[PDB]
Symmetry: C3
Subunit: 193 residues, 3 copies
């Protein structure tokens, strides 16, 4: 790791990422935000980089842009996250792992994923690239979450289920059936909106 | 700074868990006070640190007031496993309970007399109003405003940018998806006025 | 005479997570057993500690009985990050699984063969009946009595002072708000008999 880190995103999401970065031992966070702070330039000095954008589509776009412009996009992983030695977390892939997250045996976390505070990824899950597993959201064993999915605060998915790319599981929702097409699912049990 | 002994007002279940937190913090001895079930509070007691171990928000506030008005220091009991952002604000010596594995993120503010129960989460920029109770596993998303004397039940949650009126109850397992500026009892997914 | 090896009965996903707990506790070698050629339980297996990593409550109980009756020790696998009150009672050498970041508060009792899965919470004074399974993130409020062989689904919860009949299922995401002394399957917020 370098001593400094760029945090793209001047917002509460950025601040939380900065806290994780400090936890990992980064000495200084340099914020950039083209809307809300200091504008990025492709001629900035090369330090470790992180994309603290909550929106999955925007995060992917900026990830591609920054990754093209030469920067290494590290993972920010809080020291209190518990990760099985047999779990797979893509290295240097802009993944955020917040405090008290647990990732169990043989689960796979793809690039650009957010695992937010106290979320749980059970054994043998696959969490697709640029997905956001929100605060307290829990995936049971063998759950496959598609690319760019959003699992809302305190939501959950029962074992052996799949959620299609680009889907939203609402805050508090309990998914009890496979979903092979994109949707927005809310309620206990979760149903299409 | 902390005294060797602490008086815990509340000889109950809530009292037992507070005692565990106090021991976690390093207190050597906990002395229970309870006006109905054991040793009585008296204004003449030595000035040891105090805590109000009463779950009921209204009663906790009444007792907090009585104790503080008698010149006793009501400390915070904060489990060592709680993770608190350096930019979060937790009111000092304000009878706040922070249970194990609680997380409080950047710029969140926790006011006097609040309970943050086991494994609750207070996300960035929240304000948790005085004498509120955020129950076990209850989670507030970013920029949530919880009113004074509110009660968020077990495993409940509030979506981002929302406000809950003073003196409201969010039921166990409830998911608040809309602002509520009129107090009430809200239950279900999504949370509806009862 | 160093204790290094453990048999884990159940070569499944549940087996893998049990192995990670055992290795967290400092076991060096995990020997999986299951009903497949070359790895079956046998009466004359060399004696090492056992654990039964079977999620199904009824089968777990049956295998527990068999291994126990062969004079073997069925240990508890308890992750070091679990927080257990000094006044809580967890039955010793009783095949109990306690996963990462579980909290068990003052005076709660955990009976033999129980599973407390990742990030579950057992509040003060609960009684969790033998061979019950409290799933990932499921939370029992204070003084809750869970019957034998119960299953509390992912992110379910039970409100304070409630009792759940032996052999019941609380569905994933369900919030139990009333006593159930007749067994059944209870789903939704609030939980209703299926
Ligand atoms: C910082 C972190 O990472 S943690 C928190 C992160 N964020 C979240 O969890 C937010 C997740 N988003 C949501 O839950 C949802 O509001 C969404 C995406 C399901 C729906 O969004 P929108 O379509 O904008 O819904 P909107 O607020 O306009 O409400 C339409 C409604 O559907 C209902 N509804 C909205 N969200 C939910 C929900 N989570 N559960 C149940 N019902 C819901 C509303 O009650 C309203 O119903 P009505 O027609 O009776 O008025
Ligand atoms: C130690 C800790 O911090 S963790 C645990 C802390 N404590 C809690 O979480 C308890 C929170 N309390 C509750 O959720 C609720 O029972 C309250 C406050 C919303 C309502 O309490 P009461 O008014 O006494 O409700 P009561 O039990 O009489 O039930 C009336 C009911 O509304 C329903 N109901 C009660 N609570 C809920 C709930 N949380 N969600 C959905 N429905 C509910 C009941 O099923 C019954 O409906 P019915 O008319 O169909 O029979
Ligand atoms: C590793 C861990 O320990 S974490 C994961 C642990 N495992 C779990 O949490 C699984 C818990 N199991 C469940 O919740 C269940 O689905 C049960 C036991 C409630 C029901 O199981 P089944 O009877 O097989 O339900 P099935 O999937 O056939 O669905 C029957 C229906 O009830 C509904 N349903 C199923 N589960 C639930 C639930 N948890 N909440 C609300 N409704 C539900 C379905 O939507 C369907 O309704 P429909 O008639 O409109 O189609």
């Amino acid at each position: 790791r370098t001593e400094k880190i760029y945090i793209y995103g001047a917002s509460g999401h950025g601040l939380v990422c900065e806290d994780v970065a400090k936890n990992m031992g980064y000495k200084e966070c340099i914020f950039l935000d083209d809307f809300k702070g200091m504008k990025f330039e492709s001629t900035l000095p090369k330090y470790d980089f992180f994309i603290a954008i909550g929106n999955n589509e925007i995060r992917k776009k900026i990830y591609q842009k920054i990754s093209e412009n030469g920067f290494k996009i590290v993972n920010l992983i809080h020291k209190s996250a518990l990760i099985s030695p047999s779990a797979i977390v893509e290295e240097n892939a802009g993944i955020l792992i917040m405090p008290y997250v647990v990732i169990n045996a043989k689960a796979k976390i793809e690039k650009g994923v957010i695992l937010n505070t106290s979320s749980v990824i059970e054994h043998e899950c696959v969490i697709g690239e640029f997905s956001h597993v929100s605060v307290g959201a829990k995936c049971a064993g063998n759950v496959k979450i598609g690319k760019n999915c959003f699992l809302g605060i305190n939501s959950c998915v029962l074992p052996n289920l799949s959620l299609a790319d680009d889907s939203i599981l609402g805050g508090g929702a309990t998914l009890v059936k496979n979903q092979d097409e994109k949707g927005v699912f809310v309620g206990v049990p979760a149903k299409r909106m």
